[PDB]
Each structure stands twice: as structure tokens, then as C-alpha cells.
Amino acid sequence: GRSVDTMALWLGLRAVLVVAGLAVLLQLIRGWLSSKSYVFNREEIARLAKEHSGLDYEVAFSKIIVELRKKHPGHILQDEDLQWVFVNAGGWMGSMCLLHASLTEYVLLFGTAVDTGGHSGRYWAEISDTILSGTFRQWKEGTTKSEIFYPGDTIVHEVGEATSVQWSSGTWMVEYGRGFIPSTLAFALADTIFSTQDFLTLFYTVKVYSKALLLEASTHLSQLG
Amino acid sequence: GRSVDTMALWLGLRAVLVVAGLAVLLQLIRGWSYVFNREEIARLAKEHSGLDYEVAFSKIIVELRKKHPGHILQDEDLQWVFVNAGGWMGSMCLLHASLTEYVLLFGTAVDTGGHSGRYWAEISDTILSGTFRQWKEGTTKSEIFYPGDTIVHEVGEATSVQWSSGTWMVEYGRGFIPSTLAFALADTIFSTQDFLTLFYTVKVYSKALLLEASTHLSQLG
Amino acid sequence: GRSVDTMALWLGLRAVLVVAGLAVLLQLIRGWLSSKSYVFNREEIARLAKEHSGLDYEVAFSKIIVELRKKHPGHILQDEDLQWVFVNAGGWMGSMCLLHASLTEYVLLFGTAVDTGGHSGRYWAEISDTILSGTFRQWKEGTTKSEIFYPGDTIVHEVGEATSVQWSSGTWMVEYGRGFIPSTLAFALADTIFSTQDFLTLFYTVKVYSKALLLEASTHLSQLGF
Ligand SMILES: C[C@]12CC[C@H](OS(=O)(=O)O)CC1=CC[C@@H]1[C@@H]2CC[C@]2(C)C(=O)CC[C@@H]12
Ligand SMILES: C[C@]12CC[C@H](OS(=O)(=O)O)CC1=CC[C@@H]1[C@@H]2CC[C@]2(C)C(=O)CC[C@@H]12
Ligand SMILES: C[C@]12CC[C@H](OS(=O)(=O)O)CC1=CC[C@@H]1[C@@H]2CC[C@]2(C)C(=O)CC[C@@H]12
């Protein structure tokens, strides 16, 4: 009959249900009970980006990098280490220039030159994007309506929150993420693995992340030494 | 590399396809009751398509609970769950789901689009608000559909779908529903990594199955 | 503490770094050391497509196919083997009609009837797209600005270059690719494997590829004694 298939389907769905729920619980436990020392704060970066949001996004990029190096020496990558690397994730495609990255924090310049959009990702990390140019449409979970954000505004992707993001052509922003940063890595690379097959972009991403970790360790050792 | 592996892949898949095709034809003959029908849901959604999509959602849910008691989820079980599939991202609120049928409210608040999916199920979407661009397979031109229209995604058919921001519709599917699950979750597995959304999806599906089983037992018992 | 986790994360990142570098190096080695026999040249297809770029894209398709069969008989698929096959790749969705395909070259008609865009793919193959209708937005790697291309233009995706592509509704073009063609197959099918699950489209893709390869082998063997 069909009630047998219904029972079997419900049991298989229960298996998937428990597996996914325990994976979510493991994510919550690893994030929640993780290390929490912070070099930056979201409003510092927010004000720094909003202050320069009236300029051309490239002049703003340069001045923001200079100010970050001035106020946090030893935590921002050198000019020789700055690079624009494509980022394909959740169905959207942008590009990044990473300035700081540790085990618990990261700072970068993000944006796209094409109309793009997709899933924001869900992870134990609070993300904040202060727009320098363009538009940022955010569609929160559980609602049927979205909101537009413009230069000067700061969108906060909360911990455990999932949204839909959409960016118009030429949208550029300064992004600061705080939490358990490695848990985001998966989401950052899935489309690179199962969609673009761009192993050179994966190479660039892991290389800049390892360089940022090396810089953080070097600064820590020089300050204890 | 060698083309031989491609030849084996193409020749091997043709054999599996031919066997699967013969199995499908035997099932079509094997075929010869449904709670809904695509024309009922289509007319019900087209009737309320002139109102605001939220009022339309509410009135359609009320009418479905009135005309089909025991087959629609309670208000406590209704939930908007994201749906990432075929490269597009929308959201759903499931009202009914069994082994052979499902009813839901679908739509997106952002401009999105991608692959429609291919599965053994006849899908019908009656638009309440927005626009729906459909690009059928094998053709070089697409068509736009507006509120009141009803797009029928035929069994085994694959199209390209595109929805503008704020597009909302009522959807009814009939066939072998589990065969769609794969397409429903692929982007959740290999793209978004949103395991909480996967949890919500399988949870509402299991709740709908449990409600259907409870109604069946109460009607036999 | 946290320095242990930082060290473990850095070691894993270095592992991914060397593995990805070895994958890129294998791709470069398979590309550089491959066949050089070419039936066409990108400038031939580019001029042939630009000449017909003022007509309707369907009439342009027909006339370009006729001219390709005229100037290279036995290397273009028959009308019975022509078919529009969906292409989901890098996050975008279009459709193709393959006319010629070997280990080192391929020719097809590509385009989309919906607004789409995504990753162009990275592989050892030089691609050229001459636009018949629509618009083609290209965003190169390392830059923060994109460029629009219109009918008559020819975008050249160089070897090892990665871009972002975007096509407006009704965009159609003639495409010629030269290099290590199999390395693109992965990129061509990834979204079909890990997103759409459309195995019938996978069948159509491998079918048209195998038929083009069989046509090439049959022409070479029949032109020889066998
Ligand atoms: C993947 C993610 C997280 C959130 C952003 O999504 S967004 O919608 O909130 O803007 C995209 C984004 C951009 C770059 C990604 C970042 C997560 C952390 C990553 C992997 C590093 O350490 C190096 C590069 C970083
Ligand atoms: C698999 C399918 C089919 C309808 C949608 O197809 S679509 O073309 O309108 O996007 C996508 C989709 C999303 C979620 C799926 C639904 C089918 C019925 C499902 C499995 C339940 O009972 C719980 C969640 C439901
Ligand atoms: C994967 C790619 C390469 C790039 C094309 O256009 S592009 O703008 O993305 O560069 C799209 C595309 C479509 C079909 C693909 C083609 C590459 C060569 C392929 C794999 C064959 O031998 C048979 C089908 C062909």
C-alpha cells in the first residue's frame, strides 16, 4: 500500500531531522563556548566607514585602511598582502580584500560590480556591513517583505540569523565579523567547491587567511616578547 | 583525459534511462483518490488574487481549512521557511503535504531565478502578486505571467524560472512528492550550508505526514 | 587556550593551500601539454558571427550553421543531432546548441532567455563569445568595475582568467573555445550535479559530446582507409 511508504518516509525524515538538529546543536555549542577576545568592535568600523562613505569607494577604501593601520598597528595586512579575491557563496558572487583575520574576528572590504544575490549564510558569528556605495536589500527570515539599505547604513547579520541578501551593480562596503570565524569558512567555500570549481580562488582565500593568522601570531609574540 | 569514460557515462546512462523509462510506463498503467485537484486550488487562488497577498494568504488558508478539515496544518504549525533550490531563493509556508500531494504558499521578496527542477510531479502555481518568467526547455524565448495566471510545470519537464521582488503565489503539487526532496535540499547541502532550514523543512514535512496519518486513522477509527 | 586552535586552523588552511596549488598545477600541466591540431580559429568564428550579428538571432544561427557546414564539411553536427540543452554552471543558467566538439576545440550557440549571471569558470581554455543579441557584462578578476558588451563585440576569456559574467534576458551569442576542453566539463556540470539534480540534462550533455566526438573520429577514419 501507501501507508507503509508514508511510515518509511516519516522515519527517514526523522533521521534527517535528528542529524540536522544535532549538527545545529554542535554549531551552537562550539560557537557559544568559544574564545572571545576582540581587537576591534563593530561600531568603530561602522563609524570609520560611515565617515568616508561620501567619497569615492576606492578613496574610502584607502583612507579606511590607513586609519585602521593607525589605530590598530600590527593587526592589518601590509599593502603587499592586499588582494581582491572573488567570493562565491550561497548563490551570490562578490569580491573581497581581507585586512584582518584571526580565530575570533575578521575585517575586510567587500562588494560586487554586478547585480547579484542569494543566501546570507547561517553561523555563530555577528556580521556587520557598513555601505560605502550602492544598495543592500535584506530579506529577513520568517517575513514576506525586504528592506533596502543605502550608503552610511549598517546592516547587522545577527548570530544564528539567516537572511537573503541582494546587491546591485557597483555596491561596496566595509565588513567586520565577530564570533567563531572558522564556522563561516564552510559557507564561504561551498560554491567554490560545488559550483565554480575555481581552485585558484580557493588557493587565494586560504593563503590570505593563513597570512592573516600568521600576522596575528607574530604581533602577539612581539607584544609578549 | 580519455573520451572513453564519457562514452561509458553516456552509454551507461542510456541503459539506466531506458530501464527507468520502461518502469515509468508500467507505473502509468499500474495507476488504475486525491484530496485536492489543481483546478480547485487554481480557481481558489485566482478568486483572491486581486487582494493584498497577505489577506489572500489568510483567506485561502481559512477556506482550505473550511473545505478540507483535518488536512491543513494548524496556525501553530504554520511557518515561513527559506527554500534555496536550483540557484534561486524563495520562501514557503506549507499547508498540506502527503506522499502524493502537497499545498503551500511560495514566493520571494527579492529578485531571484534559476533551474525549476525536474521530477515526477505535476506542479501548478497560481500567481497572487508579482511576475513569473518561465523559459521552457528546447526553446529560445520565455513568457511572462502575472497575477491570476496559473503556470503548470508538467511531469518530467524542466524549465528556467525567474521571479521579481515581491512575487507570491499558491502552489499545489501532485505525484511522487519525495522525488522532489533531493532538488529541494541540494542547495541547502552544497551551497548555503543552512542546516537549520533543512531541519525546518523536514520537520514541517514530518508534521504534515503525521497530520495526514492522524486524519486517516480518525476516519477509519 | 586559543593558540592551539589557531595553530590547528592554520595547519588545515595550509593543507588546503597545497592541495589547491597541486590541483591548479595539474590543470596547467594537462593544458600546456595537449594537442595543437585546430580545425577553426577564433578570428574565423568571430568574423562569421559579427557579419550576421545584425540579423535576428535565429536567422543568424541558421546562416552561421550553413556557412560552417560549407567551409568545414564533416566537422559540424547534422540537423538531427542539433538540440537545445540547458547549462547550469557557476550560478548562472543558459542553454547551448553544440555544433562541433573535440579534445581541443568546440563551437556552439549559447545564450539565455532570462536575466542570469555568475562565475565564468577557470580552466586552460581560451574562449571567445561574439554577441548576436542582448548584453554581456564582464567583471574581470582583481578589478572593482565591470564592462558592458553589445552585439558585434567579441569578449575573449583568456586562459587561466576568471571573470564574473552577466547576461540580460534574450542574450544570444556564438561561442568558440580552444584549449583543454575536458577541464571545462566539470565546471559545465557542477551546478547540474550539486544544485539542479537534472540528470536528464546531464544525459543530453554527455550525449551531444559523445556524438560530436564520434563524428570527428568517424570523419577521420572514413577519410583514412578504415
Ligand atoms: C563568507 C563571509 C561571511 C559573510 C559574508 O556574507 S554577507 O552576506 O553577510 O555579506 C560573506 C563573507 C565574505 C568573506 C568571508 C566571510 C567569512 C570569513 C572568511 C572566509 C575569511 O576569514 C576570509 C574571507 C571571509
Ligand atoms: C520540493 C518542494 C516542491 C515545491 C517547490 O518547487 S518549486 O518549483 O515551486 O520551487 C520546492 C519545494 C520546496 C519544499 C518541499 C516541496 C515539496 C513538499 C515538501 C517536501 C514538504 O512537504 C516540506 C517542504 C516541501
Ligand atoms: C561550460 C561552457 C564554457 C563557457 C561558456 O560560456 S561562458 O561565458 O561561461 O564562458 C558556457 C559553457 C557552456 C557549455 C560548455 C562550455 C565549455 C565546453 C563544454 C563543456 C563542451 O565541450 C560541451 C558543453 C560546453
Residue numbers in the entry:
A (entry chain B): -5 to 219
B (entry chain C): -5 to 26, 31 to 219
C (entry chain A): -5 to 220
Original paper wording:
The sigma-1 receptor (σ1R) is an endoplasmic reticulum (ER)-localized, non-opioid transmembrane receptor implicated in many pathological conditions, including neurodegenerative disorders and cancer. So far, all reported σ1R structures are homotrimers, with the ligand binding site located inside the β-barrel domain of each σ1R monomer. The ligand binding site is located in the lumen of the β-barrel domain (β1-β10), whose opening is covered by two membrane-adjacent helices (α4/α5) at the carboxy-terminus. Here, we present crystal structures of σ1R from Xenopus laevis (xlσ1R) bound to two endogenous neurosteroid ligands, progesterone (a putative antagonist) and dehydroepiandrosterone sulfate (DHEAS) (a putative agonist), at 2.15-3.09  Å resolutions.
